[PDB]
Amino acid sequence: LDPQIVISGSTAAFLAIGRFVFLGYQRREANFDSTVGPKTTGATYFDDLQKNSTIFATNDPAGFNIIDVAGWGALGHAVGFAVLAINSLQGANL
Amino acid sequence: EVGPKRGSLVKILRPESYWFNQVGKVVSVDQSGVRYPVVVRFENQNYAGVTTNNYALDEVVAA
Amino acid sequence: MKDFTTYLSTAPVIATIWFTFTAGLLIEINRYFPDPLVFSF
Amino acid sequence: DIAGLTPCSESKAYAKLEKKELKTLEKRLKQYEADSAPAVALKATMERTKARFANYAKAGLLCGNDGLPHLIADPGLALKYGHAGEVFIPTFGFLYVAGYIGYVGRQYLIAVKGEAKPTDKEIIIDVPLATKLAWQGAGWPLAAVQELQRGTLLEKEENITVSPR
Amino acid sequence: NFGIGHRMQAILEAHTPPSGSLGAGHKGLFDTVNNSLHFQLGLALASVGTITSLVAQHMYSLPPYAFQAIDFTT
Amino acid sequence: RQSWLPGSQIPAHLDTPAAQALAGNFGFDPLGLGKDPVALRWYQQAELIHCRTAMAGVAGILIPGLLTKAGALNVPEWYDAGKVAIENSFAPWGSLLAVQLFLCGFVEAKRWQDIRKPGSQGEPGSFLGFEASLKGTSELGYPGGPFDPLGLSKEADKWADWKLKEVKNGRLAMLAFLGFVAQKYATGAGPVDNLAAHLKDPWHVNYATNGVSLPFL
Amino acid sequence: KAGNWLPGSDAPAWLPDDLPGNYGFDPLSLGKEPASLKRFTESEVIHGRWAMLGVAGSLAVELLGYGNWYDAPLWAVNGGKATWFGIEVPFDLNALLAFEFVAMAAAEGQRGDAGGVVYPGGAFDPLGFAKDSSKSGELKLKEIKNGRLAMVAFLGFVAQHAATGKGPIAALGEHLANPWGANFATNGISVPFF
Amino acid sequence: KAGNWLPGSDAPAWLPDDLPGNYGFDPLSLGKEPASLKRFTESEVIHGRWAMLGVAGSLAVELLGYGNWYDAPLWAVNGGKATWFGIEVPFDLNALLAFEFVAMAAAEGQRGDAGGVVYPGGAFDPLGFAKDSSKSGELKLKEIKNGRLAMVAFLGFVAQHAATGKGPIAALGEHLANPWGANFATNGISVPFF
Amino acid sequence: DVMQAFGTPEKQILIEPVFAQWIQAAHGKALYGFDFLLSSKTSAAFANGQSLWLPGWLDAINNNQNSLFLTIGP
Ligand code: CLA
Ligand code: CLA
Ligand SMILES: CC(/C=C/C=C(C)/C=C/[C@@]12O[C@]1(C)C[C@@H](O)CC2(C)C)=C\C=C\C=C(C)\C=C\C=C(C)\C=C\[C@@]12O[C@]1(C)C[C@@H](O)CC2(C)C
Numbered sequence A: 001l002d003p004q005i006v007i008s009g010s011t012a013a014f015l016a017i018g019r020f021v022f023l024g025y026q027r028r029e030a031n032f033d034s035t036v037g038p039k040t041t042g043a044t045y046f047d048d049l050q051k052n053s054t055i056f057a058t059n060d061p062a063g064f065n066i067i068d069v070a071g072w073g074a075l076g077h078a079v080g081f082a083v084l085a086i087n088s089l090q091g092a093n094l
Numbered sequence B: 001e002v003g004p005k006r007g008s009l010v011k012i013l014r015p016e017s018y019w020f021n022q023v024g025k026v027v028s029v030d031q032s033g034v035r036y037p038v039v040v041r042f043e044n045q046n047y048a049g050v051t052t053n054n055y056a057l058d059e060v061v062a063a
Numbered sequence C: 001m002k003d004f005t006t007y008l009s010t011a012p013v014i015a016t017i018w019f020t021f022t023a024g025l026l027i028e029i030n031r032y033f034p035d036p037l038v039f040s041f
Numbered sequence D: 001d002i003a004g005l006t007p008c009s010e011s012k013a014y015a016k017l018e019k020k021e022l023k024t025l026e027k028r029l030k031q032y033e034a035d036s037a038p039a040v041a042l043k044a045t046m047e048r049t050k051a052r053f054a055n056y057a058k059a060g061l062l063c064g065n066d067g068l069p070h071l072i073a074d075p076g077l078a079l080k081y082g083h084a085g086e087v088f089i090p091t092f093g094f095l096y097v098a099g100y101i102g103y104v105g106r107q108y109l110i111a112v113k114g115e116a117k118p119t120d121k122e123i124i125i126d127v128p129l130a131t132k133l134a135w136q137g138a139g140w141p142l143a144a145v146q147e148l149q150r151g152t153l154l155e156k157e158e159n160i161t162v163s164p165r
Numbered sequence E: 001n002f003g004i005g006h007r008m009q010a011i012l013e014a015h016t017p018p019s020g021s022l023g024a025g026h027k028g029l030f031d032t033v034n035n036s037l038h039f040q041l042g043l044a045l046a047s048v049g050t051i052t053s054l055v056a057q058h059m060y061s062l063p064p065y066a067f068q069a070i071d072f073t074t
Numbered sequence F: 001r002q003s004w005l006p007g008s009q010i011p012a013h014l015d016t017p018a019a020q021a022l023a024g025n026f027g028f029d030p031l032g033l034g035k036d037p038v039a040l041r042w043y044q045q046a047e048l049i050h051c052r053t054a055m056a057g058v059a060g061i062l063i064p065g066l067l068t069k070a071g072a073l074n075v076p077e078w079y080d081a082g083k084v085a086i087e088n089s090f091a092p093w094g095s096l097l098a099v100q101l102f103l104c105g106f107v108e109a110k111r112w113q114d115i116r117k118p119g120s121q122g123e124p125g126s127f128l129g130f131e132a133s134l135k136g137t138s139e140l141g142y143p144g145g146p147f148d149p150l151g152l153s154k155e156a157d158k159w160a161d162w163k164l165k166e167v168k169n170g171r172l173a174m175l176a177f178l179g180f181v182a183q184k185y186a187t188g189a190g191p192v193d194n195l196a197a198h199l200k201d202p203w204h205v206n207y208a209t210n211g212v213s214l215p216f217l
Numbered sequence G, H: 001k002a003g004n005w006l007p008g009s010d011a012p013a014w015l016p017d018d019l020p021g022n023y024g025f026d027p028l029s030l031g032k033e034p035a036s037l038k039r040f041t042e043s044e045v046i047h048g049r050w051a052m053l054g055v056a057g058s059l060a061v062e063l064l065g066y067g068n069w070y071d072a073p074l075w076a077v078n079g080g081k082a083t084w085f086g087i088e089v090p091f092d093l094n095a096l097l098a099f100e101f102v103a104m105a106a107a108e109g110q111r112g113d114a115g116g117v118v119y120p121g122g123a124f125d126p127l128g129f130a131k132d133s134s135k136s137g138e139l140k141l142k143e144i145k146n147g148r149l150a151m152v153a154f155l156g157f158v159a160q161h162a163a164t165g166k167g168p169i170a171a172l173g174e175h176l177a178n179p180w181g182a183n184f185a186t187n188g189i190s191v192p193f194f
Numbered sequence I: 001d002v003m004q005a006f007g008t009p010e011k012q013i014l015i016e017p018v019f020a021q022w023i024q025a026a027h028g029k030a031l032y033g034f035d036f037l038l039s040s041k042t043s044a045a046f047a048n049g050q051s052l053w054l055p056g057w058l059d060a061i062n063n064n065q066n067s068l069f070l071t072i073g074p
């Protein structure tokens, strides 16, 4: 069953459809700074824990940082392990 | 002149009033520039037993 | 006897008469058709 | 055979209950003479009991393990297995009469709203008007539907409301 | 702070049905819930009581603990 | 005035010009069901459909009943003819009822939409030219055209009496079907056999001498 | 405005006449809002194209002898060795499931990023039949009507199978063998009282 | 205006005299609307041409000895091997059914796209008999009258077979053998009691 | 109460809870004979669970000595 094949393929497919397919949609959706403004305008330490203290710059041209990577690879690992587990009991219901 | 006539039916648009959205008969409108000149008599009394109350020109509407 | 029949038209007298009537109707229905658990007739 | 319920004609607990009630009544009957007033009363009670049991078993009622008739409220199970006279038919039988009462009272209220003192026509009933409306309220469903379709059954936003709407 | 995820204000202000069947919908409700501790507390007590009743209804039908359901007093 | 109760106070809604045009207006509305003019229009339509359906059905009951009492036919009793006809049929009664409900719902929905807006099924392009003949006439319930082959509605001299004959025979036939039902449930015999048994002994064979109609008597 | 759907019923005011397939059928008033109506106009054509393909496939798989549409996916369960036109295909359920996810994700994301696009001429109109003309409107009407018919037909596939257990062509043969003893009324499902 | 259909009955005002076959027969007033009347005028000639061909065929199949019109389609059922003039034809029911669908679809679509066309001279008038002249009107009248007669005759075929079970020529022979013992009144179908 | 007082308990209104009993039979209680979803040994819901929780669930819910979906009546 080659779990390396399965999980590498799931992660690669999800990273691909996150980079090439659903990146524009996710950027259109995640741009909430709108009526929906910042959580805090204050200068307290606890107001700073809610600000984006570190913008994750990426030299990827489409803007695919370690957070997009983390998310799409997490979905890929989850789906690959789902495939492996549903194959683990050598069958499915219907 | 101001206010409905002295026998007209008038509907109340004051929310805190017992007769909100209820039709009462106008008794008198004070032509003096006073707050709440319209006197409206109602055929059903409120919780205090009162059948009339004073209403402004904003708080009354025809029919 | 306009006033007497006005009295008999009062809420308590009319209620008494009407509920005597309804109860008697139900009682006679239950005497002539006893124990009606279901509508089968 | 709806929910494990056996017909009361085939249940043995039902017959046991019948003979138990009859045994109670005849143990009361043994105390009196042949044709006493109590004897007549108890014989009539025994006849009513036997008739009641026969008429419940004849009506296709379903019985439990206790031998007591159980009613089927569900339409679809009542109409599939012939138990519509238990809850389904008397449902509309009741609703007819209840809408009768409500429609008649409604029409009386609306008719006396026009008088100069509508309140004294409610503590002192206008009996001729009330009887007219009680007789002509037999067609309450049709009249109610036609009053619903004209938009005249409901009042619009002329009803009164508290300050926070 | 990592750039991904939802803002509850967006979810709430987006869920306005057409046909105006709920009017403005859930517009202005994030502020109402987040600024009122009694709204939060009522939601929390509602959920907690419902799941306490769930606990009660499920621990007797599906006894999770060994030699429970033979300890009747328990 | 031609009232149902010569001394009654006729309801005011049946004395209006819009109601006195209706066929068979004898002031009978003791329950006030047609006090609403729209309801009166709808119920006039219901009366006409019930009356024509009942006329057709009661004819199909007692004409073949009289002809099988006279030997010209062997049609079973109307309360037996469904079983007999379905045991000689090509189809189960379920498929029959389905086809019937489709074919009847079509024409009854057309009639419905013509009641909702009179003269609306003549919207050009709806049918294949036949919608031209589906506008009806000035009077609702009296469609005419293809429903009037012999052209008896084109007089304006026999029209009121044609209406009256229809509605009166139809009320009579509705009563006749109710009587078929009650007589079957109270006697167990056919309507023509009930007539025969009444005509052989009227004073001891009637609804007063069956055990159903008057339990107190 | 092509048709009325209810002769005599005057059309709703929110359905434009230029809309392909407008018969005035909106009794629930679902398309009263213009944005809702635009989304519904796209989704109707999409559902209809997918249903046309689906009915074509469910009919071609049975008319050619490879079973019915319902029994085709029982190679994943009940063994394996998918087939197409009899040619067995070297893909198990997981591989083609994942490839379908990937491919349809790419395709429908390219379609969704286009906003509301229902008639994308060009790469999807190579033979040049629709250029927003008289023929284009007529062909849009034809497309949407065949799509509505195919949607009804697939709903019929599903219902007839859930009631009878047969295939579309098998049920058609049953009906032609006994039009009155084999219909929706004669199964013990559709009309229960029958 | 050729004939009256009811001597004394004055003609309906919606039936033009220039219409071939106008006897003033519209008692149901079906052709009161001009568009309805145009559709009906085309459909009458179409039904009539089809009925002329159909009666000619039902008579030629029995006068030549190949059975009646009703029993001809019982090769599809009850076996196979269609025949024509005795020549067996290599087509089963499905093949010729599909080819008939295709061919008649093409033909009648070409006819319907023409709008209302009932007299298409040219490719359908090679011998040049009708050029919208005196002869053309007279021949249109002849066509529509023979078509009405053939429609009546095919309705007669169907009714006489449903009542008797015989063919047209067989029923004609029965009637000529016993004009009074073999007619519509002597079967136990047409007249209800006898 | 009045019927048991008058010694005629067969005149009681004993409405069988057929909706909750139908639900119970959908979970595999074969006491009522509805044979709907998991009490139906031919359904897909029943077939797809047999490699899974359903053997134990159906041995536990049809045991009338536990409190898993007790038998109910009027
Ligand atoms: C809301 C709860 C409830 C319900 C549903 C019932 C239901 C019933 N009870 Mg119970 N009961 C209740 C509360 C309730 N009761 C209470 C609170 C008490 C204590 C006071 C009792 C004490 C009690 C006793 C002691 C008895 C009952 C009985 C009955 C049955 C009555 C059958 C009957 O009378 O047929 C009546 C049938 C009708 C068709 C009447 C309908 C009304 C009219 C007539 C219909 C209209 C016809 C027509 C249109 C009229 C034209 C106009 C007219 C003026 C001519 C029925 C099963 C009796 C029984 O046998 O139970 C098994 C019985 O003996 N009950
Ligand atoms: C439509 C007219 C009509 C006619 C001609 C008949 C005729 C007959 N019925 Mg039927 N019947 C009818 C309507 C009719 N019925 C209706 C509407 C009902 C339901 C209430 C019944 C219920 C009924 C029962 C339960 C029984 C009969 C019986 C009979 C027979 C004896 C008469 C009798 O007992 O009183 C008939 C009973 C009535 C309650 C009178 C209803 C008559 C209505 C109001 C219309 C006719 C009145 C009209 C002004 C005068 C006659 C019209 C006529 C010239 C057409 C007789 C053949 C009996 C039978 O079978 O004996 C062999 C019997 O047991 N009928
Ligand atoms: C449609 C109808 C009968 C139709 C019969 C049909 C199709 C019969 C069909 C068949 O038999 C055959 C042909 C052959 C059989 O083998 C098969 C069947 C199928 C069985 C009867 C309506 C019958 C309708 C009836 C009897 C209606 C009576 C209504 C009355 C009396 C109303 C009275 C009032 O409403 C007013 C008028 C005014 C108010 O103010 C006062 C009150 C009093 C309320």
Ligand SMILES: CC(/C=C/C=C(C)/C=C/[C@@]12O[C@]1(C)C[C@@H](O)CC2(C)C)=C\C=C\C=C(C)\C=C\C=C(C)\C=C\[C@@]12O[C@]1(C)C[C@@H](O)CC2(C)C
Residues within 6 Å of the ligand: G025, G026, G027, G028, G029, G030, G046, G047, G048, G050, G051, G053, G054, G055, G057, G058, G068, G069, G070, G071, G072, G073, G151, G152, G154, G155
């Ligand atoms: C029926 C349907 C929609 C019906 C909608 C209706 C009636 C809507 C009606 C209304 O909303 C309007 C219009 C206006 C409102 O005011 C009123 C109502 C009444 C509310 C959609 C079907 C839509 C159906 C679709 C999209 C079908 C697609 C099918 C496919 C892809 C099939 C694939 C396969 O069959 C093959 C090819 C081979 C097999 O082996 C494998 C599988 C996968 C099974």
Ligand SMILES: CC(/C=C/C=C(C)/C=C/[C@@]12O[C@]1(C)C[C@@H](O)CC2(C)C)=C\C=C\C=C(C)\C=C\C=C(C)\C=C\[C@@]12O[C@]1(C)C[C@@H](O)CC2(C)C
Residues within 6 Å of the ligand: H025, H026, H027, H028, H029, H030, H046, H047, H048, H050, H051, H053, H054, H055, H057, H058, H068, H069, H070, H071, H072, H073, H151, H152, H154, H155
């Ligand atoms: C009777 C008929 C139409 C009759 C219409 C009439 C009376 C209309 C009358 C009215 O409308 C008017 C005028 C005016 C209105 O105001 C009044 C009425 C009264 C309403 C049409 C038949 C129309 C008949 C037609 C079209 C027949 C076509 C037949 C064909 C094709 C036969 C083919 C075959 O027989 C062969 C060749 C060989 C076999 O083996 C196979 C088959 C297939 C069986």
Ligand SMILES: CC1=C(/C=C/C(C)=C/C=C/C(C)=C/C=C/C=C(C)/C=C/C=C(C)/C=C/C2=C(C)CCCC2(C)C)C(C)(C)CCC1
Residues within 6 Å of the ligand: A011, A069, A070, A071, A072, A073, A074, A075, A077, A078, A079, A081
């Ligand atoms: C250089 C470059 C490249 C490449 C790159 C790469 C290759 C990257 C990768 C990346 C990656 C490779 C990533 C990954 C990620 C991953 C992740 C992120 C994971 C996660 C996981 C998780 C989350 C888990 C979970 C879980 C567990 C723990 C267990 C079981 C259950 C579950 C599954 C749930 C190219 C050529 C394109 C070009 C450009 C640049």
Ligand SMILES: CC1=C(/C=C/C(C)=C/C=C/C(C)=C/C=C/C=C(C)/C=C/C=C(C)/C=C/C2=C(C)CCCC2(C)C)C(C)(C)CCC1
Residues within 6 Å of the ligand: E038, E039, E040, E041, E042, E043, E046, E047, E050
């Ligand atoms: C006053 C107020 C308040 C409070 C309120 C409350 C308290 C409420 C409550 C509420 C509640 C307390 C609710 C509940 C609910 C419930 C529900 C809603 C349920 C549901 C269910 C479902 C949906 C199910 C499903 C299913 C089933 C049926 C079974 C099996 C499984 C499944 C899943 C399938 C607040 C603060 C807000 C503020 C405002 C005011």
Ligand SMILES: CCCCCCCCCCCCO[C@H]1O[C@H](CO)[C@@H](O[C@H]2O[C@H](CO)[C@@H](O)[C@H](O)[C@H]2O)[C@H](O)[C@H]1O
Residues within 6 Å of the ligand: A022, A025, A028, G108, G109, G110, G111, G112, G113, G114, G115, G116
């Ligand atoms: C039947 C079995 C298969 C089920 C289908 C699975 C669908 C799950 C969708 C997940 C991805 C959603 O994204 C996909 O749909 C969105 C609309 O809903 C599209 O969103 C689009 O329409 C929105 C309308 O305001 C706008 O944001 C943009 O025009 C556009 O982004 C995305 O451009 C598309 O990429």
